Every structure is written in C-alpha cells, then in structure tokens.
Symmetry: C2
Subunit: 434 residues, 2 copies
C-alpha cells in the first residue's frame, strides 16, 4: 500500500508532503506532522463534509487518492502518474488534484496534469512563477501569491516615508523569489532604493546583522525568512544591542506569531507583518484529536505518524493525543479544506448544468477544460467564513491583515491590527507604535 | 493486446502511425501500410540486426515496446504513459523512444519524456519548431528540419537571379510552418519579395493557378505540397495552358518522384526539387516481403494489415505479398532504422564507459540525461552508408540532392542531379535545362 484510496463516483487527487526530503540518495525522510499529516487529514475531513452535505453534490459521491509528495519534485511527478493510471488498461476517474505544498513540487506536477487537462488547486504554493496561466493554465491556488504580498509590503514601505529599504530572504524557494518580487515591485513603483539584499541560509547570524548595519541608513529590513530564521536574526540583533534601530517588515512566514518573539520582545517591538486573512476551522479541531489507531485506518500513514508524535513503537494506547502540552495545532488548514471545497463547488456547478440523476456520461469525459472554467468562476464562503475565489491567472485575491508588535502598555502587549490589504492599502498610523 | 512487446535487458520505445486519424469521435482510422506498418516493421528489422550484431551491444540485448500513434497527439500522449509504466508498482526499463511520425504528435510525446528525462529520436518530424533544445531538450531527429530545406531553397532562388518568388504550401503542419521558414529565411537574407502565399487545402486547383497568374511577374513558385497536391496543381496549370511559365521549386515531398509527373511531363519540365541524401536498405527489402501470417506473429497488427493489403478476410494464403504489381516499397525506411541505430550506438558507447559484464547498476538508473549526452555525440555510418549525426539542437545536419526534371534529349528524360546541399550550396547551371 503506497497511498490512501477512498472510492467514489468521482475521485479527487491528493499530494501532501507526508515525509520530509530525505538525505542524498534516500527519497523520503522523517514524517512531518503539521505540514504532512495535518494538511493530509484536513482533505479527508473536508471530503467527509462534502460527501455528507445534502445541498452539495447530493447524488455524486467524491472519492480520494491522496499520495506522498515526500517534499521532492521528481518524487511527486512519478507519484502523479497514478492520477492518469485510468488511461491505460476498479478504475479511478481522477477529476482534479489538490496541488502540492511547495511550489517547485507544484510546478513539476502542474506539468503532467497540464498535459492531461487535469485541473489542480494548490493550498500552499505561493511562488509568483505559477501565476503564468499560459505555462500553468490548469493550475490555480487557494492561497494568494507572494507578488500580492510584495506589493502590500511596498505599499506599507511607500506610505511610511521610506525610500531606503533592505531585504533579508531565507535561502530557498519561498525566500528568494518573493524578495525578487519586492525588488521588481520596488523598481516598477517609485524606486525605494534597496541598500543590501542579504540571503541567509548564530555566529553567521551575527555577521548578518554586521553586514546589515553596514548601511546604517537602511532603517527598514524587509524579511522573507523561515520560522526559526526570524528568531535567529532577532537574537543576533539584540546581541548587537540594536533595540529599536531596525525597522522589521515581515512576510506571511512571520505573521502574528509570538514563538519567534520569546525573549526577543524588545528588538522585535514595532515590527510590521502581513498575515493572510485566515481563521481556524472549528469543526476540524475536534476531528484530528479524535483519531485513534483502531478507528482511523483510513489514513495509511497514521501508524507511522503515531510512532513519531509520541516517540514510541512501546506504544499501547489510543487516548494518547492528549499529550500535546508541548505541541499544538497547525495553520493553513483553512486553505486545504477550502481548496477541496473549491473543487466540490465547481463539480456541483458542473453537474446541474450538464446532467439524468447523477454523474452523467455528458460530463463524464474527464475533460477538466470545462471544469477549469468552473473552478475559476467559483465564488463562495469558505471553511472559515472567508470568501474563496480566483482571478484570471488562477491566484486567489490577496486579502491580508497587517500587524505590528507592541510592548509599552499592558493594554497593548502583542500584535496589533495596524491595517488590512484587500487590494487597496489600509494602514493606521496613530495605532502604530515602535 | 494493445502493443508489440519484445523483451530485452533494455527496452526501446516505439510510436508509429499504424492507423490513420479516424473521423470525429473515432480515435483510430484505417491501417496505413507504407507509413505505419512499413516504418514499424523497419524498427523490428533494425533491432534484429543490433541484437544479432556481435560488435555492437555484445552482451546487452535490446527489447521493444512499439505503440500505435493512431496519427493523433492526445492518443500518442496517453500511449506514451507505458514508457513510464515501470515507475509505479515483468517490468520494462524503457531507455529511449523512437519518436513519432508527425511533429504535432512528436511534440506531444516530447513533453512527457522530457519530464521523465527519457531521450527520444524521431525519424520523420521535420517541423522547425522542434529544434528548440530548450523547450525540447531530450528530442532529437534523424531527419533534418525544414529550416535547412528552406535555406537551401532560398540559396537556389538567390543564385538564379530571382528576387520575386511565390509560395504554395499544403494546408497542414508540414506545409505551413515550412513555407514560413522560407518566408523568414527570405526576410533575413536578401529579401526576395514574396508576391503571394497561396495555402491549398480540381475546380479549386484551377482557381489556385488563376490566383497565381495574378502576379505574372512571380516566375518561380516555391512548393511545400502533399504528394497528390503537386499532381493536382500541375494538372491545373497544364489546363491553364501554362507550359514553361511557372518555375517550380519543390520541397522534399516532391523530390525525385515521377508519380506526380505522369502526363504532367511538359509543365513540370525543369522543376527544382530537394531530396534528402537517402538510399534504400538492401537487406530490409528481402525482409518485409518475407513476412507471412504464420511466421510473423511478432507484429501484433499484421493480421489487420494482411486483410487490408490484399483486401480480404476470404484470405487463405501466406505467399500473397507477391501481389504488389500495383504497390511498391516505402521511402524513409533508411531513417527509422538509422534512428534505432543512433540509439543502439549511444547505448553501446554508454556501456564500455560505465560498466562488469553487461547492463551494470552504475548505468541502470534510466537517466537518459547522460544517454542524451551520448545520442548527441553519436557519429557513425548509417543503414545506407549515409553518415548519422546531430547538431547541438539535436537536428541531423541537412545533406540534400537538388534535382531538376528534363525532357528534351532521350539522354535526359527524368530527374537530373543539379547539385547538392551539404550546408554550402552546390548548383550546376550548364546541367540545367527548362
């Protein structure tokens, strides 16, 4: 068994990073809970609701064929061939694919499905590259791209009277190409000269702050760093005794997260962050925690996950998920589910239009060319009361929540909502405090 | 059974247009002998010789997995998935693919194999589009592209003092894009103004000559027409009483063929044609004719072919291929075989370099990235004593034989060798006669 297979009149493809990118030679690494098991389980949860929804796809049951990305393009590409296993001879009629976490993977997959006119909806890929609806015409993303985020950041930088900014992107996909967007959006706009562009892959981190203070005029540092990388730049900057000198503008990797802010409260004070308009799905919380080994067979990775989540093998007991006093939930679950809904709403819209009782031959063609024309024109309330739609390029419109960290008053300890970015920039300057 | 499968240590992919492009809805049409069965049988013949060759791949047997293109891109694309059937679980280790007749198909296939780093060698696709070694980096062609042919035609047009030419391309792939090359090669060069560009899909043909005589200054007509289309333009022009007015410059579709020249001897007189340096494989002629229904089981389409070649079902008798007094051989067989050799020579070169006794794990990786680097650096005598190689773009260098039809003397009735096009233009003007 190399996958999860739920049977249904129509089947939805799944690609999740269940396993981390293993070392050189070894294809799959350790299991990754929050990013692979959680997001995975979210789809299963989402499909459950759809299949139980009497108002949506009332006579057409949805199936699942979730597969392991293993955080590798080549791996997910060969893994995607099963979403085409029907085209050669119970046969699976894959109708669309819940696109992968990780753009470099997502592109690799958005290449076979493009050829088989299979439409795809990612939940995590934000690389501005994927917005080329010509190179990737069947791809669409339920998260917005980093370009929107960058324009938002340029908008905030522009509105505070900063024409000398600095960038600091974590070496990798998310970091580099996102900071590039900013660069280009800065070039195209007014030209808020970028002093330095530091690319970070704690001795080295102290050199980063040393290289940044090299341009002491560069007040503001635009950050596109991984979760710990922010924490390790801050600690480096506090060590550099640089409290309230730097003007942090953080990407969505930062957001309203207090974890990179522990002990780093003084230096981080007044940092600006853009978190996508997100909310936590209330129903799904009671679900994931419910899952035992005896009941949750569905998840063909759950015994593997169980041995890791609790660190065990002896492991006899199912009530164990109560042990999470060190480990909490996972964000971006709202998106996964929504992508699954974006598919289910499109299919249901395709049904009342072409069908008969249910799943007619007139639609059956596995022509996602018409379904793509439906996924794109899909505009409904999502799993958290946040609208779900796409532009002509297939990226979801970027609606954000600009936050700023404050410490002064006991009426202000934490992230304050400085403004929003629907597409026009909303930013309050009396509510701001550095 | 949907294919031919010969087992071997290493297996070579095959895609042939066994069946014509059926009507709207119906995927496969009738069988096509010369273009589907012949070319198909050539590969089988070619692989036989390689597998029997003690000097080439001496301990590594080559297998075959030939498949029906059915003259359709979508069809051949889904047909190509078997060349990847190994990547999910006797398993077949496909190493390369003998690329399809028909560029629009060839591109569609050069899209999955590109993704699976499977190298491919076409035998018939000449669309100048495929020379983009970036968009098609694993594709290579044992025939030259039409661009070479076009530059040759411009070279001949340039050397005869013609700055006013006309074009006439058959509506389709081969016709249009080839005539476009000429247009561009004319634009880039000296600018031999094109009067009209007639695209032909015998009342209509007489209108073609009517539209062509509209620019009576346009002495020369550059033709990229299908085999009968030339015959139907000539008959149209003779009816138009236009003997020795037009100056035909014919593409490789014309060549040294007397079939479009029956009764049309007077109008066609002096026409210039470019035939690729080709010769007929002596061994293979005695092979194809040998094939009976009882012996030749190998060919999973041969019973279907047999019922068509002789028009029968009653059909009891194997000695029947003697009935060919109306139907002869098939050209371009030299190319197919050569492509198969181009693969076998590359594999053998890859073996002595990486291997052990035979088919080592150190090469086994099905990484055609290194094999592509071998196919490209392959330079040997082909199946007809005509060198086989590739440029950095993967197209075989264009070596041609410029012919001209003559009728005057009984020492000259037929196509005379006016010159050659290795890359520098060779053209004799005393040997020419209109």
């Amino acid at each position: 068994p190399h996958s999860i297979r739920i049977e249904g009149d129509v089947t939805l493809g799944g690609l999740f990073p269940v396993h981390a990118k293993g070392p050189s030679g070894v294809p799959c690494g350790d299991i990754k809970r929050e990013n692979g098991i959680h997001r995975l389980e979210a789809m299963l949860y989402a499909l459950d609701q759809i299949n139980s929804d009497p108002n949506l796809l009332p006579n057409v049951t949805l199936g699942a064929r979730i597969l392991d990305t293993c955080s590798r393009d080549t791996y997910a590409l060969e893994q995607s061939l099963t979403f085409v296993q029907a085209l050669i001879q119970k046969p699976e009629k894959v109708v669309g694919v819940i696109g992968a976490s990780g753009s470099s993977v997502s592109i690799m997959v958005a290449n076979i499905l493009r050829l088989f006119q299979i439409p795809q909806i990612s939940y995590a890929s934000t690389a501005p590259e994927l917005s080329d609806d010509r190179r990737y015409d069947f791809f669409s993303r339920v998260v917005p791209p980093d370009s929107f985020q960058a324009q938002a950041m340029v908008d905030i930088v522009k509105a505070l009277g900063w024409n000398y900014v600095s960038t600091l992107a974590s070496e990798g996909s998310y970091g580099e190409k996102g900071v590039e967007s900013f660069t280009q959006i800065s070039k195209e706009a007014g030209g808020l000269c970028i002093a330095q562009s530091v690319r970070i892959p704690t001795i080295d981190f102290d050199r980063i702050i040393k290289q940044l203070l090299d341009t002491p005029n560069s007040r503001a540092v635009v950050i596109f760093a991984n979760d710990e990388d922010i924490k390790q730049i801050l600690a480096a900057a506090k060590r550099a005794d640089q409290v309230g000198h730097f003007l942090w503008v953080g990407s969505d990797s930062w957001g309203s997260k207090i974890n990179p802010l522990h002990q780093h409260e003084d230096i981080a004070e007044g940092a600006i962050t853009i978190q996508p308009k997100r909310a936590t799905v209330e129903g799904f919380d009671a679900y994931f925690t419910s899952r035992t080994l005896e009941n949750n067979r569905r998840n063909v990775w759950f015994a593997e996950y169980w041995e890791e989540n609790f660190n065990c093998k002896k492991c006899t007991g199912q009530e164990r998920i109560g042990k999470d006093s060190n480990y909490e939930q996972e964000g971006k679950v709202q998106f996964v589910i929504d992508a699954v809904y974006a598919m289910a709403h499109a299919l249901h819209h395709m049904n009342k239009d072409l069908c008969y009782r249910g799943v007619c031959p007139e639609m059956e063609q596995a022509g996602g060319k018409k379904l793509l024309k439906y996924i794109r024109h899909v505009n409904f309330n999502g799993s958290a009361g946040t609208p779900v739609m796409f532009n002509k390029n297939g990226d979801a419109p970027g609606r954000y929540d600009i936050f700023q960290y404050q410490t002064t008053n006991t009426t202000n300890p934490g992230y304050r909502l400085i403004g929003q970015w629907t597409d026009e920039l909303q930013l309050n300057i009396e509510d701001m405090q550095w």
